[PDB]
Amino acid sequence: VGRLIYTAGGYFRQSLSYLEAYNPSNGSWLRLADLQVPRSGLAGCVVGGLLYAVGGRNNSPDGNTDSSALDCYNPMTNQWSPCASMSVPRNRIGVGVIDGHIYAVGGSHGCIHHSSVERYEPERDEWHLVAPMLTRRIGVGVAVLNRLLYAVGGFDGTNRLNSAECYYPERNEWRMITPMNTIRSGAGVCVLHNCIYAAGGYDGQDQLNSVERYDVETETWTFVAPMRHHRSALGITVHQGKIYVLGGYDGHTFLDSVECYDPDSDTWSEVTRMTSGRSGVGVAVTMEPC
Numbered sequence: 079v080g081r082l083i084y085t086a087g088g089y090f091r092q093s094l095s096y097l098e099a100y101n102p103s104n105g106s107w108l109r110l111a112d113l114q115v116p117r118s119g120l121a122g123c124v125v126g127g128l129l130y131a132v133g134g135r136n137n138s139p140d141g142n143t144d145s146s147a148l149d150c151y152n153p154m155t156n157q158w159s160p161c162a163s164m165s166v167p168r169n170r171i172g173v174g175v176i177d178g179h180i181y182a183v184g185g186s187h188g189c190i191h192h193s194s195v196e197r198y199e200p201e202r203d204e205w206h207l208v209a210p211m212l213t214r215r216i217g218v219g220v221a222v223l224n225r226l227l228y229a230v231g232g233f234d235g236t237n238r239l240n241s242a243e244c245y246y247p248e249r250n251e252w253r254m255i256t257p258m259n260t261i262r263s264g265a266g267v268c269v270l271h272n273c274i275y276a277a278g279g280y281d282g283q284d285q286l287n288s289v290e291r292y293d294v295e296t297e298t299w300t301f302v303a304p305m306r307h308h309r310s311a312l313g314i315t316v317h318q319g320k321i322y323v324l325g326g327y328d329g330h331t332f333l334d335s336v337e338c339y340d341p342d343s344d345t346w347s348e349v350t351r352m353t354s355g356r357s358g359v360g361v362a363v364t365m366e367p368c
C-alpha cells in the first residue's frame with residue numbers, strides 16, 4: 079500500500095486542527111481525524127508507522143497558548159492519542175527522528191526563545207533533556223542525516239540566523255557547521271541523498287524563494303533552483319526521492335500551493351493545491367489509513 083503526505087495543523091486566521099493526507103500516486107486529498115487541540119507552529123514526524131504532532135501554539139479568538147503536547151495519530155484506526163508532554167511549551171519548533179527517538183529542538187514559550195533540546199522514547203512514553211544547542215532558535219529547521227541531527231537557521235530573539243549546528247548523539251554535544259549563504263527563519267529543512275536542503279524562510283525583511291543545500295562530505299552550501307513561490311513557515315517532506323513543499327506565507331497570501339523538486343533536472347513544479355491556504359503546518363509521510 080502506498081504512502082501519503084500528511085499535513086497537520088497550521089494557521090489561517092487562527093490555528094487549525096486539520097489533518098489531511100495527499101496521495102502523490104493519484105492527486106487525491108483525504109480529510110482525516112482532527113487534532114484534539116488546534117495548533118500552528120508545530121512539527122510532524124513518523125516513528126514505527128505512527129504520525130506524531132509536536133509542540134506549536136493555539137492562536138485562537140480567546141487567546142494564545144503555547145503547546146508542550148505530543149500527540150500520536152494511528153492511520154490504522156484514524157485516531158489521535160495523547161502522549162507524554164514535553165518539559166516546556168515549544169512553539170515554532172523543529173523535530174528530527176534518530177534511532178526511533180523524537181528530538182524536539184528549540185521553539186518559543188512566550189518571550190522565551192529556547193536553546194534546549196529534549197528526546198522522546200516511544201517505548202517508555204518519556205521525554206528527557208539532552209545537551210542544549212549553542213544558539214537559541216525558534217522557527218528552526220531540523221534534519222537527520224547519517225544518524226546526526228542538524229538545526230538550521232531560525233530566530234534567536236534578536237536576529238534571524240544563517241547559522242547551523244550538528245548534534246552528535248554519542249558525545250551529547252552540539253558543534254557549529256558552516257553557515258548557510260542566506261539568513262532563514264521558518265525555512266523548510268529536509269534531507270535528500272547526502273545533502274541537507276534549506277528552502278525558503280523569512281529574513282526579517284522578505285519571504286524567500288531561494289533554496290540551498292549542504293553536502294556533509296564537502297561542508298559547503300550550494301544554491302539550487304529557487305521555488306516558484308516565495309514562502310516562509312512552509313511544510314516540507316520527502317516522498318519517493320522528491321522534495322515536496324506545502325503552503326506557507328509570501329507576505330500577501332497564506333498559500334495553498336504545493337511544489338515538488340526533482341533533483342535530477344533541478345526543477346520545481348506545481349503538483350497540487352492544499353484544500354485551503356495555510357502556514358506553519360506539520361508534515362510527514364506514512365502509510366495510507368485503514
Ligand SMILES: COc1cc([C@@H](CC(=O)O)c2ccc(C)c(CN3CCOc4ccccc4S3(=O)=O)c2)cc2nnn(C)c12
Binds near residue numbers: 265279
Ligand atoms: C515576525 O514576522 C515573521 C516571523 C517569522 C518566523 C519567526 C521570526 O523570524 O521572527 C516564523 C518561523 C516559523 C513559524 C512557524 C512562524 C509562525 N507562522 C508564520 C507566521 O504566520 C502565523 C501568524 C500567526 C500565528 C501563526 C503563524 S504560523 O503560520 O505558525 C514564524 C516568519 C515570517 N514570515 N513573514 N513574516 C512577516 C514573518
Ligand SMILES: [Cl-]
Binds near residue numbers: 135169170
Ligand atoms: Cl506564532
